[PDB]
Design a protein around this ligand. Structure first.
Ligand SMILES: CCCCCCCCCCCCCCCCCC(=O)OC[C@H](COP(=O)([O-])OCC(O)COP(=O)([O-])OC[C@@H](COC(=O)CCCCCCCCCCCCCCCCC)OC(=O)CCCCCCCCCCCCCCCCC)OC(=O)CCCCCCCCCCCCCCCCC
Ligand SMILES: CCCCCCCCCCCCCCCCCC(=O)OC[C@H](COP(=O)([O-])OCC[N+](C)(C)C)OC(=O)CCCCCCCCCCCCCCCCC
Ligand SMILES: CCCCCCCCCCCCCCCCCC(=O)OC[C@H](COP(=O)([O-])OCC[N+](C)(C)C)OC(=O)CCCCCCCCCCCCCCCCC
Ligand SMILES: CCCCCCCCCCCCCCCCCC(=O)OC[C@H](COP(=O)(O)OCCN)OC(=O)CCCCCCCCCCCCCCCCC
Ligand SMILES: CCCCCCCCCCCCCCCCCC(=O)OC[C@H](COP(=O)(O)OCCN)OC(=O)CCCCCCCCCCCCCCCCC
Ligand SMILES: CCCCCCCCCCCCCCCCCC(=O)OC[C@H](COP(=O)(O)OCCN)OC(=O)CCCCCCCCCCCCCCCCC
Ligand SMILES: CCCCCCCCCCCCCCCCCC(=O)OC[C@H](COP(=O)(O)OCCN)OC(=O)CCCCCCCCCCCCCCCCC
Ligand SMILES: CCCCCCCCCCC1=C(C)C(=O)C(OC)=C(OC)C1=O
Ligand SMILES: CCCCCCCCCCC1=C(C)C(=O)C(OC)=C(OC)C1=O
Ligand code: SF4
Ligand code: SF4
Ligand code: SF4
Lengths: 115, 156, 176, 55, 257, 52, 70, 318, 97, 80
């Protein structure tokens, strides 16, 4: 209940600092002030063209390493169990499998960027 | 009347906030920009006056035309000035930005940036010293201080 | 007579290898840069308090132009047009005629300050020390045509700044 | 040159160099703004004899 | 740099554009007390170079922006018409203050920094060591300053003094004719190039016997360096091309004229 | 962000200096050289002076 | 000199002292001059709701000791 | 009287942002051998008020090519997520005492990237596009250690409760057993918060302003004050993690003063790092957090799992 | 201890401006409160001060007048307000006031 | 082996520190006397309720009061 009130307050006086930002000053709108900024000369083409990602294999492997901190994250709680050597072996197995994955991603030059 | 006093104090408030928070833009052309960097240097130090650069025109308040305006860059100068939100100001630094200068009779030089943009403060020199440029900036602050925006709104 | 910048091979004993590995893992040169920046934090800054404190100048300084007079009231400019013949930007425009006592004087002495390049060839070409480029540099205008000085503005600059221009010429004239 | 020896010692330790020996702010060690009038020398052609310009 | 602009303002009257070094010598002699202040500046400037070099040279972030960036081979440096540090970063032992010396550079002893890898970082170290060697040459020039005049005593080229212009007839005629017509340069063309701090800065001056130039081409180093930018930027990114435009120290007034 | 081609368009500060030099005398053409490499002023003065 | 940064930092220091101090006082105003009850686990919430049920004034912070029993 | 507690939280941590602008400019000035602002107020103490009034009386300039809905939603979400990451921070009592406040901090870090990201997309500009995908390249670099470091430090805490982390450090600071984690977390929070040497999104020299290059004044204010709220919250969070102070249950203001001055020293440390280093190229960013910090972070994760078992010092989860 | 000397120099800078009122006067008009040897005062009220222990640039300053030629220059101090006889001394064109 | 180890400590000291810390985390709990005490503390922490027993007549190892001398004791934890 308090979390919803706090988020509503933060969103409200973040959007009441915008509605007094757009309506308070004086505008002189003309169709060169709102032109796209390209350091003074007119932009060649659109900025909606494909902006080719060089770091794409690291971008995919981030999705496979971000799951690990959905897997390695119960370890402060998993240390509270009564079968603890099994827990320790499986935990070091998970960090070791992450590390073997990172080693394989190094050695095939997957962490390097293309071109 | 009371309302004239209220709009006078609010004019004083907005003129204070605009002259004491001038953001020029990283925009030089020629030798004057070296001296404009010396006006940013620790001896004269624009930043003590609230004067600090912002590279984008959208978040800049004054454009110091510091150098020579040629013909090939005059539309770039005009579009950079146009992409500044109002209120925006122009300080013309040096002789070539003022009136053509040492390249006045040249085929390729715009004879003063006041053919392109409306100019507020003309700073003379070749180059003007960084102290003379800072004098022109403080004169621009005095020009902003005596603006009467809300008083003229209240009277029109 | 030449030196090889960056031709050092690192030492490969275990001492220097462990020292560089501690530099890498424990960030020694980064702490050196932080230490030098923290060293400048505790200094007196070079910021002079303009407009109450002024940058130091010399008696050779080239600022605002001024037409000087003799110590009797008579102006010095005898219309000889060397200052506009040597002017590298053609900022000076002179028109002259004999005035009412037959003296060679100017009717027009214009200096366009927005063509002027402030190099001081006019003050070194003047045979009578009439045009000088005085000490004023704080003369920024709010309009362009206020920086197009006629003869009246230049003579008023001389009458304004004479008590300093005479002293600066007295300080420098042996070098000229 | 008006800094306290605590700040002076901290500053010397942080830079690793002696800073009061080489200060970048200038003080009374610099030249005077008012100088005696000079007597500049003349060149080799400032003679009254054997000074034909064609030679 | 502000203190050296004070040195310019004292010696000539303007902080940046002096018009002080003239054909025939210089315009005006050194004022009294100038060289002692140049000594007091040069005594302390080495600590400033030291702390710049402390902030950048051994820094790992500065090296990772400049060590494998903008490598120029020697033959492509000579082919692209590079000069100065752009050659000296690549190991080409060439400096016009040594090889083709001008006014008294054969009378001052200094060193020429030679880079090893042609990258931005060796050119950085070449510029820092040229600041060191410039302090060295300023020490040698302050110790070895001779007495005498400062213009050529051919008074048909350099103007006379104002103390003798107002007394002598020939000096008044020469003042008049040098500040209105000027001296007549004999016909012919030269290409005079010096070691400017950006490299070989040249003037190709063509005179037709008149008192005005017929042609004056200005060879700038930055023109050829910015031409070679397109080769130097290959295989790099925007944050590296900004370092390549930094290490090719461009002032566009000489690039564009 | 890998750079494939750089085309530096210049001449945005082409003032036409060395045509203005042709219509001015040598002493008047000297201050044009201060403004070419405007961080290396007296070196440009020295180069032009040595040429003349 | 450098100590002129010490006013502004001090103002910023007060602007970081005001929130947390205030919430401590706010936790001592709504909760009967004591700390705010921390219910991280549902047993703590069960004891807190039991306190709210046995207070007689529907406030969990109003405590009842041996004076309530005979 | 909780809404008053929310206001007395979020309004002083806007005034702290305001005077952090002045502290930034003046500490940055004195480290650059100059002064900061001293003209506008008495030694600059009224400069941020002039900046705050100036940005909301300047024309807002919604661009022509901008997808306007995301363009307005990006600074709103920026300042919303900047304010709402202060609520689980114990001061010594948090506003909202969460059992999993650390994961709240981490998830609302992950949602704050979309402010920069949708600002770079919506403002249909090329430099804004570069500044947005450099935020992608920066966030996929720091998030792959920001959770493992923060995991390994809480294996000595027992939970994800930030208030328990005061009880954890009652004897010794948690920087003494975990200074490699501390010095790696500090760089991960530099790279998280887009501060130098890891600016890389508002790149002044590569880009013009990066993602907020189209944002004129008013909407630009809500990215800038969001970024400074992020750095003050992040140094308070770093202080709670590694420099947790003495807490008296009867005198909370002692703890409040203590972590206030520690987080101020870490804020000055951010300003002092921004005043001293060149900027990384944003691939060398990625070859740092993946090739250097990530192997050692996995190694320290193995060590900080096994070591409370190795010494029978597993902390309680209650 | 030398911090006590620092506090004594601050309090005697408060003393040297005629008390708290003049201290705040020179603070809000000058952004600078250090005392100086009064070199002179022109025919307008502009007071000219030395402090040779300061570094070269800070060693000579001017506190401008509050009324020059009919304009209220309390807050609108201006660099062009210095008369030409003090413009050599203030800009260090000479040693002599 | 010291030559290869010095080579990898000269080129990649981050990875050498990584493999050293990881190898310690692998082998070192298997050589420590305190790993048993971790398990004993974790199984000695009373999360649930100790549900009592119906006394049939023959349970001499099970107490009838918590302060009785038979039953599991935590004096090893109090001393350590
Ligand atoms: C560290 C925490 C702060 C401790 C105080 C401090 O550092 O004082 C500066 C004092 C002097 O520093 P300095 O850079 O060597 O100054 C030399 C100048 O000649 C000394 O400067 P001066 O010769 O010009 O003396 C005049 C000066 C005197 O300076 C002071 O009085 C300093 C302010 C003290 C409060 O007074 C002023 O300039 C007026 C300043 C008015 C605003 C001061 C705002 C301070 C923050 C509180 C709000 O620092 C020390 O003595 C070293 C630090 C001592 C720490 C002690 C333990 C804590
Ligand atoms: C969060 C921190 C910042 C908070 C916000 C800033 C605090 C101060 C808010 C009030 C400032 C003053 C009014 C806004 C600025 C107006 C600027 C302007 O150009 O005004 C001229 C305009 C009128 O301009 P105009 O009619 O002269 O038009 C000129 C432009 N042409 C001719 C091209 C169309 O005045 C106003 O809009 C008046 C605004 C309200 C004035 C005060 C009312 C009472 C408030 C109590
Ligand atoms: C939070 C409180 C404060 C904490 C401290 C932080 C404050 C000081 C910050 C200084 C400014 C830093 C600004 C950003 C700098 C960015 C650059 C940077 O840091 O790069 C990282 C650099 C990168 O180095 P690099 O980039 O030079 O690496 C070169 C890499 N190759 C060769 C592949 C090209 O260093 C690291 O990655 C080290 C990370 C921390 C190491 C911690 C190790 C601890 C010791 C472990 C044990 C060792 C012994 C072995 C086991 C023994 C068992 C018995
Ligand atoms: C058994 C213990 C637990 C082991 C598993 C847990 C590991 C935890 C850390 C996670 C590491 C994940 C990523 C590891 C990648 C390793 C592969 C690799 O990077 O190889 C390449 C590297 C040389 O780099 P290069 O190919 O030149 O790359 C160019 C761009 N930099 O090659 C090298 O630098 C050589 C690497 C191998 C030699 C390292 C020797 C370290 C010895 C320390 C003491 C003994 C420790 C016990 C382990 C046995 C080691 C032999
Ligand atoms: C019914 C009647 C009232 C009607 C409504 C008005 C309410 C009050 C509005 C604010 C005050 C109005 C007056 C504003 C200042 C006017 C006087 C002025 O400009 O004085 C100039 C003086 C500085 O002089 P200067 O020329 O700059 O100095 C040269 C350097 N030596 O300037 C100074 O010395 C400093 C000036 C400070 C201005 C006030 C402080 C800032 C504003 C605070 C309130 C608004 C913002 C609130 C918070 C917003 C979120 C951050
Ligand atoms: C948690 C802590 C947060 C603290 C936040 C604020 C920090 C800074 C506090 C203020 C610092 C000093 C400000 C000084 C303002 C200017 C004073 C002054 O001299 O103003 C003069 C000006 C013009 O008056 P004039 O008639 O020209 O005077 C001629 C004199 N013979 O006349 C004027 O300018 C008109 C009067 C304007 C007065 C404005 C005062 C400042 C208001 C700041 C807003 C916040 C105040 C604190 C709120 C919380 C605490 C209650
Ligand atoms: C179109 C673009 C978007 C435009 C609008 C943007 C709006 C704002 C977006 C940002 C905010 C997103 C909030 C998402 C939910 C966050 C929930 C949360 O804060 O959980 C943390 C905390 C965990 O603590 P816990 O362990 O439960 O302790 C209590 C039990 N003893 O939980 C607690 O302490 C429990 C407190 C009650 C929680 C109520 C359930 C969550 C309510 C979600 C509201 C809607 C979220 C919308 C998300 C939009 C994402 C863009
Ligand atoms: C942040 C420190 C002050 C920088 C102020 C730059 C303002 C714009 C000047 C233009 C300029 C730039 C960018 C520049 O980088 C540069 O190179 C040295 C110049 O000289 C050739 C310039 O003229
Ligand atoms: C109430 C919140 C007020 C927020 C004020 C935002 C505007 C102030 C920006 C000042 C600034 C800072 C701090 C700054 O960090 C910076 O970088 C050096 C600037 O120049 C590019 C600045 O202009
Ligand atoms: S007015 Fe003159 S000195 Fe100034 S930028 Fe122009 S050419 Fe260079
Ligand atoms: S200073 Fe030079 S440009 Fe100016 S008027 Fe004199 S001769 Fe002409
Ligand atoms: S050179 Fe001197 S006397 Fe001759 S016209 Fe010019 S100002 Fe007059």
């Amino acid at each position: 209940m308090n979390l919803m009130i706090t988020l509503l307050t933060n969103f409200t006086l973040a959007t009441l600092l915008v509605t007094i930002a757009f309506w308070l000053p004086q505008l002189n709108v003309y169709s060169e002030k709102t032109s796209p900024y390209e350091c003074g000369f007119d932009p060649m083409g659109s900025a909606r063209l494909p902006f080719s990602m060089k770091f794409f294999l690291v971008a995919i492997t981030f999705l496979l390493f971000d799951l690990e901190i959905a897997l390695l994250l119960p370890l402060p709680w998993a240390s509270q169990t009564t079968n603890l050597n099994t827990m320790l072996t499986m935990a070091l197995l998970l960090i070791f499998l992450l590390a073997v994955s990172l080693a394989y991603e190094w050695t095939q030059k997957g962490l390097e960027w293309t071109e | 009347s009371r309302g004239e006093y209220v709009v006078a104090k609010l004019d004083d408030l907005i003129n204070w906030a605009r002259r004491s928070s001038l953001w020029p833009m990283t925009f030089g052309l020629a030798c004057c920009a070296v001296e404009m960097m010396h006006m940013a240097a620790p001896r004269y130090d624009m930043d003590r006056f609230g004067v600090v650069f912002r590279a984008s025109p959208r978040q800049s308040d004054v454009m110091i035309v510091a150098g020579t305006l040629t013909n090939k860059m005059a539309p770039a100068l005009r579009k950079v000035y146009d992409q500044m939100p109002e209120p925006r100001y122009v300080v013309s630094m040096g002789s070539c930005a003022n009136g053509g200068g040492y390249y006045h009779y040249s085929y390729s030089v715009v004879r003063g940036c006041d053919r392109i943009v409306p100019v507020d403060i003309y700073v003379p020199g070749c180059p003007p010293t960084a102290e003379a440029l800072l004098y022109g900036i403080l004169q621009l602050q005095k020009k902003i201080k005596r603006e009467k925006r809300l008083r003229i709104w209240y009277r029109r | 007579t030449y030196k090889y910048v960056n031709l050092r091979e690192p030492s490969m004993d275990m001492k220097s290898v462990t020292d560089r590995a501690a530099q890498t893992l424990l960030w020694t040169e980064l702490i050196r840069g932080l230490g030098m920046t923290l060293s400048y934090l505790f200094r007196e800054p070079a910021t002079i308090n303009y407009p109450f404190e002024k940058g130091p100048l010399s008696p050779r300084f080239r600022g605002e132009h001024a037409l000087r007079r003799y110590p009797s009231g008579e102006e010095r400019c005898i219309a000889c047009k060397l200052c506009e013949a040597v002017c590298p930007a053609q900022a000076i425009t002179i028109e002259a005629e004999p005035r009412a006592d037959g003296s060679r004087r100017t009717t027009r002495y214009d200096i366009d300050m927005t063509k002027c390049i402030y190099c001081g060839f006019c003050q070194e070409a003047c045979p009578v020390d009439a045009i000088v480029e005085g000490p004023n540099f704080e003369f920024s205008t709010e309009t362009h045509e206020e920086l197009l000085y006629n003869k009246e503005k230049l003579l008023n600059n001389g009458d304004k700044w004479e008590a300093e221009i005479a002293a600066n010429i007295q300080a420098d004239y042996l070098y000229r | 040159a008006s800094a306290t020896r605590l700040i002076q010692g901290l500053r010397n330790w942080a830079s690793g160099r002696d800073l009061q020996a080489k200060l970048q702010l200038r003080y009374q060690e610099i030249s005077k703004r008012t100088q005696p009038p000079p007597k500049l020398p003349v060149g080799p052609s400032h003679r009254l004899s054997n000074n034909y310009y064609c030679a | 740099r502000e203190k050296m602009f004070e040195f310019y303002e004292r010696v000539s009257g303007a902080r940046m554009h002096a018009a002080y070094v003239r054909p025939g010598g210089v315009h005006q002699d050194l004022p009294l007390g100038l060289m002692d202040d140049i000594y007091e500046f040069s005594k302390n400037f080495s600590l400033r170079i030291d702390e710049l070099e402390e902030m950048l040279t051994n820094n790992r972030i500065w090296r990772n922006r400049t060590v494998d960036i903008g490598v120029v081979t020697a033959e492509d440096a000579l082919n692209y018409g590079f000069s100065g540090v752009m050659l000296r970063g690549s190991g080409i032992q060439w400096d016009l203050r040594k090889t083709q010396p001008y006014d008294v550079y054969d009378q001052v002893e200094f060193d020429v920094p030679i880079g090893s890898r042609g990258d931005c970082y060796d050119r950085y170290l070449c510029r820092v060591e040229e600041m060191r060697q410039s302090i060295r040459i300023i020490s040698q020039c302050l110790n070895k300053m001779p007495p005498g005049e400062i213009k050529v005593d051919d008074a048909k080229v350099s103007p006379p003094k104002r103390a003798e212009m107002k007394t002598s007839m020939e000096s008044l005629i020469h003042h008049f004719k040098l500040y209105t017509e000027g001296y007549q340069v004999p016909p012919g063309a030269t290409y005079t190039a010096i070691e400017a701090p950006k490299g070989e800065f040249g003037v190709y001056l063509v005179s037709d016997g008149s008192s005005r130039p017929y042609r004056c081409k200005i060879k700038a180093p930055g023109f050829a360096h910015l031409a070679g930018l397109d080769k130097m930027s290959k295989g790099h990114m925007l944050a590296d091309v900004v370092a390549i435009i930094g290490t090719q120290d461009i002032v566009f007034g000489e690039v564009d004229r | 962000e890998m750079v494939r081609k750089c085309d530096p368009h210049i001449g945005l500060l082409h003032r036409g200096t060395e045509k203005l030099i042709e219509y001015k005398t040598y002493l008047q053409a000297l201050p044009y050289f201060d403004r070419l490499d405007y961080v290396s002023m007296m070196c440009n003065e020295q180069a032009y002076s040595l040429a003349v | 000199m450098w100590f002129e940064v010490l006013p502004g930092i001090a103002v910023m220091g007060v602007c970081l002292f005001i929130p947390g101090m205030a919430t401590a006082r706010i936790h001592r105003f709504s909760n009967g001059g004591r700390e705010k009850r921390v219910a991280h686990y549902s047993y703590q919430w069960y004891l807190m709701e039991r306190d709210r049920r046995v207070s007689g004034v529907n406030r969990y912070y109003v405590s009842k000791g041996l004076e309530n029993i005979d | 009287m909780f809404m008053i507690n929310v206001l007395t939280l979020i309004i002083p941590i806007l005034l702290a942002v305001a005077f952090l602008t002045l502290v930034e400019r003046k500490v940055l000035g004195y480290m650059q051998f100059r002064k900061g602002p001293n003209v506008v107020g008495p030694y600059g103490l009224l400069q941020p008020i002039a900046d705050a009034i100036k940005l909301f009386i300047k024309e807002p300039l919604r661009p022509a090519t901008s997808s306007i809905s995301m363009f307005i939603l990006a600074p709103i979400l920026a300042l919303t997520l900047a304010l709402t990451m202060w609520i689980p921070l114990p001061m010594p009592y948090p506003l909202i005492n969460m059992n999993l406040g650390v994961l709240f901090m981490l998830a609302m870090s992950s949602l704050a990237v979309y402010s920069i990201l949708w600002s770079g997309w919506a403002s249909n500009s090329k430099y804004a596009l570069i500044g947005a995908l450099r935020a992608v390249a920066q966030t996929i670099s720091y998030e792959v250690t920001l959770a493992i470091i923060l995991l390994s430090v809480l294996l000595m805490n027992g939970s994800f409760t930030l208030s328990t982390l005061i009880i954890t450090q009652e004897q010794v600071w948690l920087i003494f057993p975990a200074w490699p984690l501390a010095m790696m977390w500090f760089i991960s929070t530099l790279a998280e918060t887009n501060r130098a040497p890891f600016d890389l999104t508002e790149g002044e020299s590569e880009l013009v302003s990066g993602f907020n290059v189209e944002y004129a004044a008013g909407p630009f204010a809500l990215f800038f004050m969001a970024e400074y709220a992020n750095i003050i919250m992040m140094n308070i969070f770093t202080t709670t993690l590694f420099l947790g102070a003495f807490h008296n249950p009867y005198m909370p203001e002692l703890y409040t003063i203590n972590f206030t001055i520690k987080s101020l020293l870490l804020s000055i440390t951010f300003l002092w790092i921004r005043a001293s280093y060149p900027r990384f190229r944003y691939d060398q960013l990625m070859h740092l957090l993946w090739k250097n910090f990530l192997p050692l972070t996995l190694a320290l994760c193995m060590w900080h799992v096994s070591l409370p078992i190795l010494l029978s010092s597993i902390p309680p989860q209650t | 201890m030398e911090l006590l000397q620092v506090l004594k120099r601050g309090l005697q800078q408060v003393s040297g401006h005629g008390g708290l009122r003049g201290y705040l006067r020179v603070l809000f008009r000058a952004n600078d409160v250090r005392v100086g040897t009064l070199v002179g005062e022109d025919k307008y009220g502009n007071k000219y001060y030395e402090d040779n222990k300061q570094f070269f640039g800070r060693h000579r300053w001017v506190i401008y007048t509050t009324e020059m030629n009919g304009k209220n220059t309390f807050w609108d101090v201006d660099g062009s307000m210095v008369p030409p006889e003090w413009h050599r001394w203030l800009h260090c064109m000479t040693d002599d006031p | 082996v010291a030559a290869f180890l010095k080579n990898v400590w000269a080129k990649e000291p981050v990875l050498v520190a990584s493999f050293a810390i990881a190898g310690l985390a692998v082998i070192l709990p298997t050589l420590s006397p305190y790993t048993k005490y971790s398990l004993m503390i974790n199984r000695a922490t009373p999360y649930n309720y100790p549900v009592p027993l119906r006394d049939d007549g023959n349970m001499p190892d099970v107490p009838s009061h918590p302060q009785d001398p038979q039953g599991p004791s935590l004096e090893w934890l109090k001393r350590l």
